[PDB]
Short mmCIF file of C-alpha atoms and ligand atoms in Angstrom, two decimals:
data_model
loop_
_atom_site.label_atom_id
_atom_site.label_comp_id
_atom_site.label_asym_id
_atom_site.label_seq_id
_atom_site.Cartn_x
_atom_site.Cartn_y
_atom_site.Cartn_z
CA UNK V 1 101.90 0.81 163.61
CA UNK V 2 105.42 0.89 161.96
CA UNK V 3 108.17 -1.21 162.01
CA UNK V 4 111.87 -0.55 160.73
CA UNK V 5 114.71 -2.95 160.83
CA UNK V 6 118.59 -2.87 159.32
CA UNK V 7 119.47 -5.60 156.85
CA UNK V 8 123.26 -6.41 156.44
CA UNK V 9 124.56 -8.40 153.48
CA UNK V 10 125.95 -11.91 154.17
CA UNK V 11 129.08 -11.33 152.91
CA UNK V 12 131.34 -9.25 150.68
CA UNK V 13 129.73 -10.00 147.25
CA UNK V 14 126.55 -9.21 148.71
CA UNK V 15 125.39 -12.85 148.39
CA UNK V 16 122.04 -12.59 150.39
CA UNK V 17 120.83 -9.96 152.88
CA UNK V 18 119.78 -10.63 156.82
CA UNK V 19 117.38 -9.10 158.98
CA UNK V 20 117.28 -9.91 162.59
CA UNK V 21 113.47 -10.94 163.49
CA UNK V 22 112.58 -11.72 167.75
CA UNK V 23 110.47 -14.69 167.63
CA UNK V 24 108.57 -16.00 171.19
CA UNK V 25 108.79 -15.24 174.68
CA UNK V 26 111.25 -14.30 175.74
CA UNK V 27 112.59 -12.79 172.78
CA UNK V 28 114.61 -15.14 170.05
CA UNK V 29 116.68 -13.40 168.20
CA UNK V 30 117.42 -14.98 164.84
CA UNK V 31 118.60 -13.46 161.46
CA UNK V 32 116.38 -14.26 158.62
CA UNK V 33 116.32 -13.80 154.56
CA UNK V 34 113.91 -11.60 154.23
CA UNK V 35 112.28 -13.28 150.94
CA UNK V 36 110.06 -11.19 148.72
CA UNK V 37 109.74 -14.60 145.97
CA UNK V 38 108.40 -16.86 149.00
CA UNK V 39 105.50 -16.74 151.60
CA UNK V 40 107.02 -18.97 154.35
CA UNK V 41 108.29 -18.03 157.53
CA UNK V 42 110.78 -20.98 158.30
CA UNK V 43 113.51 -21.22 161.08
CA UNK V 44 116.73 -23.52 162.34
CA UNK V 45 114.93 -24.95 165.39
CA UNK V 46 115.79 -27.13 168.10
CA UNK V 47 113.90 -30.17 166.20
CA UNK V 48 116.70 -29.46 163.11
CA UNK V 49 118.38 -32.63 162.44
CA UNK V 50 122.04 -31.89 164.29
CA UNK V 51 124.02 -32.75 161.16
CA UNK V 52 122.36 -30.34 159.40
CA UNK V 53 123.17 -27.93 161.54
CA UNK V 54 126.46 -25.59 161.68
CA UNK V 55 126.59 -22.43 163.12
CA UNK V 56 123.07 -21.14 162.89
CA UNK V 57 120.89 -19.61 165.77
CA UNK V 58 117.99 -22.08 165.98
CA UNK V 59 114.28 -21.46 167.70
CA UNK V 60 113.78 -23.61 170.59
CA UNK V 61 109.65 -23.49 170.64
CA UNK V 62 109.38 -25.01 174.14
CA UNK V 63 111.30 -22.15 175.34
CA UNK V 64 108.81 -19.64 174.33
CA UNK V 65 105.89 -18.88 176.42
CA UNK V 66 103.26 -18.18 173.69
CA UNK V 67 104.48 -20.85 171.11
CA UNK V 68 101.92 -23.37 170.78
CA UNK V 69 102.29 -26.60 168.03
CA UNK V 70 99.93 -26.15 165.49
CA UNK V 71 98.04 -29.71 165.17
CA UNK V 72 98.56 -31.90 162.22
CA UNK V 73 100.21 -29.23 160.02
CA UNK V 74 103.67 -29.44 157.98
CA UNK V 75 105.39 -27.56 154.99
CA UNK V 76 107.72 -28.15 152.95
CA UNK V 77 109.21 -25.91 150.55
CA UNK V 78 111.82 -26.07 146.98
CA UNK V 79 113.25 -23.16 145.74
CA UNK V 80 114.90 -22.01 142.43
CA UNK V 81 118.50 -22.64 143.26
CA UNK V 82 117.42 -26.69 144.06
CA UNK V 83 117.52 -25.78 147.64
CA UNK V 84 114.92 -26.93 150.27
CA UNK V 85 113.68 -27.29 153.61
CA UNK V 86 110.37 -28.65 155.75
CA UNK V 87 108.70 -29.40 159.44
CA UNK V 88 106.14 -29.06 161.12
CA UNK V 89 104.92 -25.49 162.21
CA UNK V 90 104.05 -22.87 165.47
CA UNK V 91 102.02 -19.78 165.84
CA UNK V 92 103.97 -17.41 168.04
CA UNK V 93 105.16 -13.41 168.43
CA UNK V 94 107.16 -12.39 166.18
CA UNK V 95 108.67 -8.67 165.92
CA UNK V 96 110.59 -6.86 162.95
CA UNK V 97 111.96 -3.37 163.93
CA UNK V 98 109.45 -2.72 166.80
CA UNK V 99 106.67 -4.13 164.62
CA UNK V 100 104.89 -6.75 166.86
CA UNK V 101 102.39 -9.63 164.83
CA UNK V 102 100.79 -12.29 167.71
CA UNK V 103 100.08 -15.31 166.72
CA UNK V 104 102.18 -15.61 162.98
CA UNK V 105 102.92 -19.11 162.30
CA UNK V 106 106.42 -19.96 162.79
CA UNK V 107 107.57 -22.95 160.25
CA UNK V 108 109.96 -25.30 162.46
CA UNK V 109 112.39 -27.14 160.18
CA UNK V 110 113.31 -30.78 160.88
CA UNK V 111 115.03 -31.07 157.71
CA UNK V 112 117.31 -28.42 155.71
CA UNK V 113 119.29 -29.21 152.54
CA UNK V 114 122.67 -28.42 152.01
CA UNK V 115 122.90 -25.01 150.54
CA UNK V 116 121.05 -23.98 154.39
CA UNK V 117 123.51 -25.78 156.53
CA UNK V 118 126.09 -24.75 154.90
CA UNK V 119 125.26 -21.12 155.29
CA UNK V 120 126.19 -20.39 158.98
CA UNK V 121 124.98 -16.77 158.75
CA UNK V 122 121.05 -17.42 157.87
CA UNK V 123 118.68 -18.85 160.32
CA UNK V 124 115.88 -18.93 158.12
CA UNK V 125 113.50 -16.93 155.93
CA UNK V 126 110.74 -14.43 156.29
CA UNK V 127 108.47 -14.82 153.06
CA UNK V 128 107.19 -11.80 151.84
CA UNK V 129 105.57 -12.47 148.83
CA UNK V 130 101.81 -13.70 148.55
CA UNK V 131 100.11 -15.66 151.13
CA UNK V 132 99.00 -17.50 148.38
CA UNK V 133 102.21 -19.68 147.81
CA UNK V 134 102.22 -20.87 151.87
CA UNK V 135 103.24 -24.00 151.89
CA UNK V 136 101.35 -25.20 155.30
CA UNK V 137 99.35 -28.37 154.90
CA UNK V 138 96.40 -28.92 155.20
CA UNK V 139 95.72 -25.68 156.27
CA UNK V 140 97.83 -23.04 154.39
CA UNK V 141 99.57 -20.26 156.58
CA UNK V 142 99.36 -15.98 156.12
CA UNK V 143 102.46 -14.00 155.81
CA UNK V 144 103.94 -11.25 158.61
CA UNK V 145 102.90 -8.73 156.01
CA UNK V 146 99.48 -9.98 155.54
CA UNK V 147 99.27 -10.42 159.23
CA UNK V 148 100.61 -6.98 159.85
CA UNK V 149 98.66 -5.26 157.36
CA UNK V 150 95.61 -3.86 158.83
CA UNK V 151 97.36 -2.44 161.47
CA UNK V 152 100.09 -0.52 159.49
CA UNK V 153 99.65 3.11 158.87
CA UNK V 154 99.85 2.20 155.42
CA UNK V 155 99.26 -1.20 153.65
CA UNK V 156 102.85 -1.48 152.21
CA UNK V 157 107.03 -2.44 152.75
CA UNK V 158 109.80 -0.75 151.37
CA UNK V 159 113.12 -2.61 150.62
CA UNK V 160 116.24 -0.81 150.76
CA UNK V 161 119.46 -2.98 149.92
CA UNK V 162 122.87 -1.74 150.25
CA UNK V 163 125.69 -2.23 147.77
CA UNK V 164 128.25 -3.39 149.84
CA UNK V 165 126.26 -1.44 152.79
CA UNK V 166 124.01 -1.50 155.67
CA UNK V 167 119.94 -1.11 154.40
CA UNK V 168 116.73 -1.17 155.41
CA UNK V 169 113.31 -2.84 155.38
CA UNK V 170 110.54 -0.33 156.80
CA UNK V 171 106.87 -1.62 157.20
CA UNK V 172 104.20 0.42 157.04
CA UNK V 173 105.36 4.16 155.86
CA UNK V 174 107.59 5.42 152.97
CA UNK V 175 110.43 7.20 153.59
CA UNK V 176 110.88 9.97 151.60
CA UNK V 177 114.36 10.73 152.64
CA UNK V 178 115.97 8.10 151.63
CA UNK V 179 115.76 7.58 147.41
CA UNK V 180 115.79 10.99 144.88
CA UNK V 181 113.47 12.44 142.46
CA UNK V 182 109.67 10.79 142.56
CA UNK V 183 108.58 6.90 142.97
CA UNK V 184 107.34 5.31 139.40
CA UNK V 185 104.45 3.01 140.13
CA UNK V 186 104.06 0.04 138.14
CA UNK V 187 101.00 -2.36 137.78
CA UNK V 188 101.58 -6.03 139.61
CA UNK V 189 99.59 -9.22 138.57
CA UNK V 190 99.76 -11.78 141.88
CA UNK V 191 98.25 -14.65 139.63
CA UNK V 192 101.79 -16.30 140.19
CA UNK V 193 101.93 -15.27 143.88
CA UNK V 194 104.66 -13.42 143.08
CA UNK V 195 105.55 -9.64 142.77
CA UNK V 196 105.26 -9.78 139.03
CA UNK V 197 105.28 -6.86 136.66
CA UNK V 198 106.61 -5.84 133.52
CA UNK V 199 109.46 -3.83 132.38
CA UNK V 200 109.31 -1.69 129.67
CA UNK V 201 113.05 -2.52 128.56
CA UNK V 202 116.48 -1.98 128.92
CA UNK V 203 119.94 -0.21 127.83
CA UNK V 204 123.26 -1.49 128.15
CA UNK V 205 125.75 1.02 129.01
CA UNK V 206 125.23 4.32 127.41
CA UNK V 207 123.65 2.68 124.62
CA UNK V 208 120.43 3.77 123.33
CA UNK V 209 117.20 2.35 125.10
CA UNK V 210 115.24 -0.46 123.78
CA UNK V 211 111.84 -0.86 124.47
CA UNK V 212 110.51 -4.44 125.41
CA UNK V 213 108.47 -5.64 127.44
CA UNK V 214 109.81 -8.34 130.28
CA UNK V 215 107.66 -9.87 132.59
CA UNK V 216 109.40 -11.02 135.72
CA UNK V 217 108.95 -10.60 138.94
CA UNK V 218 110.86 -8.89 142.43
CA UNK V 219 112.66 -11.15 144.36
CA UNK V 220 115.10 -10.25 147.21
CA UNK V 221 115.30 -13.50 147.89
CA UNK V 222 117.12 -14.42 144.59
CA UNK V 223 121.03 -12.92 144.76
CA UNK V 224 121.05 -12.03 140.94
CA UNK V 225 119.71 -10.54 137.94
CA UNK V 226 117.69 -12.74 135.56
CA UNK V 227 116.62 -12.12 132.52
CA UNK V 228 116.04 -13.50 128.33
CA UNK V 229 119.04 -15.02 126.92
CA UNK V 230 118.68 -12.42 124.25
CA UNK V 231 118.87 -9.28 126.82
CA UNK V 232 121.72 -11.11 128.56
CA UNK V 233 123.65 -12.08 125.40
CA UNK V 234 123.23 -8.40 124.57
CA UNK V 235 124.52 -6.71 127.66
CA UNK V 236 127.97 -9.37 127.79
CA UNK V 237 128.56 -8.62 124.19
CA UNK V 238 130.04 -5.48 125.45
CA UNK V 239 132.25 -7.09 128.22
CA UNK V 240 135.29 -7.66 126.37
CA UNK V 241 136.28 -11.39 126.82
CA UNK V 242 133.05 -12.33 128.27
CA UNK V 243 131.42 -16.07 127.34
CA UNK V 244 128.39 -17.91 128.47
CA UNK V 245 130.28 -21.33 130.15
CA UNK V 246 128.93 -24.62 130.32
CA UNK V 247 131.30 -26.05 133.00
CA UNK V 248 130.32 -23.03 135.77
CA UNK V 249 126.63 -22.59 134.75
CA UNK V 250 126.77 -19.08 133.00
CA UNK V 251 128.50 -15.64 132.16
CA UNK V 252 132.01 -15.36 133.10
CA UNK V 253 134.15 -12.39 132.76
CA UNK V 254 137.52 -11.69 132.50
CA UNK V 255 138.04 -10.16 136.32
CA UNK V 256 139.99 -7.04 134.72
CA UNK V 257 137.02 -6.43 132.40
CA UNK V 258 134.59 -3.44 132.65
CA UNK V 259 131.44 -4.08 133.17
CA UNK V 260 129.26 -1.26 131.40
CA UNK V 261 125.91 -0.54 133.61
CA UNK V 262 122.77 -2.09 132.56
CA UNK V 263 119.60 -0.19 133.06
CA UNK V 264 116.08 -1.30 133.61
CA UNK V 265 112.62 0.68 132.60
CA UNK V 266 110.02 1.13 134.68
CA UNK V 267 106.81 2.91 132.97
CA UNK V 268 108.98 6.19 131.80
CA UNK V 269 111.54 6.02 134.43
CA UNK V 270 114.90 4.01 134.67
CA UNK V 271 116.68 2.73 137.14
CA UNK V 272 120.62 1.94 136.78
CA UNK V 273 122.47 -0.62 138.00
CA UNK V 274 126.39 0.63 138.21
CA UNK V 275 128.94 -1.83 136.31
CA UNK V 276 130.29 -3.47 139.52
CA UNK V 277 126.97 -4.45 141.09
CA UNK V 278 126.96 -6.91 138.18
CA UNK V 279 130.48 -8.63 139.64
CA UNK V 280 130.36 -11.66 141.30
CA UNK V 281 133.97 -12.30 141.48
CA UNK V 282 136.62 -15.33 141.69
CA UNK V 283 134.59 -18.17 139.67
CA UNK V 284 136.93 -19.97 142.63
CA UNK V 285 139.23 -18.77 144.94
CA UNK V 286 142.42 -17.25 142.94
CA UNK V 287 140.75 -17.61 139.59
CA UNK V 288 141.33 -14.78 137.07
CA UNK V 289 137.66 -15.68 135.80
CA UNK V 290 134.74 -13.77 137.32
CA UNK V 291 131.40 -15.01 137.21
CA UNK V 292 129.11 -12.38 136.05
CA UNK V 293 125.86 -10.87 137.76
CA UNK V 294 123.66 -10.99 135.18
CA UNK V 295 122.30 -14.43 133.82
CA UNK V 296 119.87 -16.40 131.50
CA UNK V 297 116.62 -16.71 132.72
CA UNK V 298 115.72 -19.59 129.51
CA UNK V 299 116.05 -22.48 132.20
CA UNK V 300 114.63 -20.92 134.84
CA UNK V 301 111.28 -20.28 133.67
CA UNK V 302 110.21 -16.60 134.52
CA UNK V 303 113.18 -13.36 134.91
CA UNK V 304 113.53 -12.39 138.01
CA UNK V 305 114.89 -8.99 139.35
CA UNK V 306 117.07 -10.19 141.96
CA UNK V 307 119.39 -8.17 144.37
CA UNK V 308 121.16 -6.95 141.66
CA UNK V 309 118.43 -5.08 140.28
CA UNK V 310 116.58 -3.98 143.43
CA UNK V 311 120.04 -3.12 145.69
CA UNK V 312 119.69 -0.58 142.89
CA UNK V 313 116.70 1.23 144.09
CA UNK V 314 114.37 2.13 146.37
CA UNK V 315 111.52 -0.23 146.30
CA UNK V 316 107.94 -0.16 147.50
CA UNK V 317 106.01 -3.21 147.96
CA UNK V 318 102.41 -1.83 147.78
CA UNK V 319 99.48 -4.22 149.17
CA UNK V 320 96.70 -1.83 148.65
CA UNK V 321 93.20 -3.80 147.68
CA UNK V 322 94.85 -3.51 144.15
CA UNK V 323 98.63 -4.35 144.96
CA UNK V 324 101.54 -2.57 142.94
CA UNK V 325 105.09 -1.64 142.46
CA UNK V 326 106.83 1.30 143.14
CA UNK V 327 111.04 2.33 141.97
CA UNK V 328 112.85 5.41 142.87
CA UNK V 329 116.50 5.88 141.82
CA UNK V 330 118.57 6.42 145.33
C1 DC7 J 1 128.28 -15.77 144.32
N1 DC7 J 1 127.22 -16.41 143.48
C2 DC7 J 1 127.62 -16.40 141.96
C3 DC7 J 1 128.82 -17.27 141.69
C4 DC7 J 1 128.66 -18.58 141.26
C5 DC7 J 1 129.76 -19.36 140.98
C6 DC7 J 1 131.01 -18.80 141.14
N2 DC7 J 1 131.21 -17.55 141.56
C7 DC7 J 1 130.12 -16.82 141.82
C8 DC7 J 1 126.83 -17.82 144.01
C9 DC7 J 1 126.23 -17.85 145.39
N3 DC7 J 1 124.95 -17.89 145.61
C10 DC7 J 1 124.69 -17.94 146.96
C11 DC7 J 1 123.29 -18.12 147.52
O1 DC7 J 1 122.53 -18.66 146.45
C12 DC7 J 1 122.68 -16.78 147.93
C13 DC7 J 1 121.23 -16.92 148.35
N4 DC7 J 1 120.91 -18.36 148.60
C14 DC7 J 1 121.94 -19.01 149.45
C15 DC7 J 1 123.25 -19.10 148.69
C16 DC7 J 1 125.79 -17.93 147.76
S1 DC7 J 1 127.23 -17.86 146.81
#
């Protein structure tokens, strides 16, 4: 099988990307993060506390035919920007693009934190990265990949995010029409659950390329571009004006700057990132201050090649026996 499904950003800066996924029976239709740094599969739901609520689509499970409660089991689940979310979970169908998996558990949230309810446009989030990180207790939960897996054509996903555009996430094929020149495949250690490899180094600009290695890992989950604060301090250093700021939490930019492109190695090849993907605009509404789209990765813990990196190319999500990575320029 196949499946092949059109992700749209949330908003203009490109914030976060949705997917719409039909969960139950009859078809729910609700648009979910598509999360490549998590392995849960949570939704708004019908047992969300109503205040925390505001404008999402929510799953109602006794509404669907083949949802049944799974005894005894809850999750609950922190992420990297303080965020979280947990409840109590479901098996039931769920279908991406035409690809159908029975019986994938479906993590009902009675409680979302703030960051959620205040985002109208996602309903929840389709973890993509190793089963490994679940969060289901006592009995830890697969992901629709890993359920979908054996039954692909071909054990892998593709992520294709649009700057300021339409994309796609395909499972189960590669299609070759839509990056240039050849796929680089890169090596990918899952002793983090994560999607971790290792860059062999960057170049700011047109400056000359410096080979380093940085470990860090694919997320499309995370909206930016982490990395060490001396890569970062290197690439604003050429934005004219640019400081690291306390009172906003990073790189700001004067909005009439221009921001030089930053590139990123993988094995031999490189992948650019064009100057304005790295613009986050308005630190607040009217503000001549922009906040910038490449960050510190020293409090964090681990760099992380966010949207702004991977909106950049044409990525491959390989779960062979021996999982890897692969980039193509687009
Ligand atoms: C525009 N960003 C940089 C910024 C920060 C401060 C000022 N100006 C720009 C911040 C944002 N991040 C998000 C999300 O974290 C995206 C995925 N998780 C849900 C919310 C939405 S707005």
């Amino acid at each position: 099988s196949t499946g092949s499904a059109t992700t749209t950003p949330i908003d203009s800066l490109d914030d976060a990307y949705i997917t719409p996924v039909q969960i139950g029976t009859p078809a729910q239709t609700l648009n979910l993060d598509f999360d490549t740094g998590s392995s849960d599969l949570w939704v708004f739901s019908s047992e969300t506390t109503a205040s925390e609520v505001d404008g999402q689509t929510i799953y109602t499970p006794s509404k669907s035919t083949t949802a049944k409660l799974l005894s005894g089991a809850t999750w609950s689940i922190s992420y990297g920007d303080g965020s979280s979310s947990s409840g109590d979970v479901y098996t039931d169908t769920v279908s991406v693009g035409g690809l159908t998996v029975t019986g994938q558990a479906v993590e009902s949230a009675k409680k979302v934190s703030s960051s959620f309810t205040e985002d109208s446009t996602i309903d929840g989030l389709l973890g993509l990265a190793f089963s490994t990180l679940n969060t289901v207790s006592p009995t830890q939960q697969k992901t629709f990949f890993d359920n979908a897996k054996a039954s692909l054509d071909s054990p892998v996903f593709t992520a294709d995010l649009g700057y300021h555009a339409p994309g796609t996430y395909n499972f189960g094929f590669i299609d070759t029409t839509a990056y240039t020149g050849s796929i680089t495949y890169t090596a990918v250690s899952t002793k983090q659950g994560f999607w971790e490899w290792t860059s062999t180094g960057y170049a700011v600009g047109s400056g000359t390329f410096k080979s380093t290695s940085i470990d860090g890992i694919a997320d499309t989950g995370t909206t930016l571009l982490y990395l060490p604060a001396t890569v970062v301090s290197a690439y604003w250093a050429q934005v004219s004006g640019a400081k690291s700021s306390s009172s906003v939490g990073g790189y700001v930019f004067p909005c009439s700057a221009t921001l030089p492109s930053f590139t990123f190695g993988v094995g031999s090849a490189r992948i650019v990132i064009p100057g304005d993907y790295i613009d986050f605009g308005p630190i607040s509404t009217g503000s001549s201050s922009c906040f910038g789209g490449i960050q510190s990765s020293a409090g964090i813990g681990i760099n992380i090649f966010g949207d702004v990196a991977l909106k950049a190319a044409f990525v491959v999500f390989n779960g062979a026996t021996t999982p890897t990575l692969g980039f193509a320029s687009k």
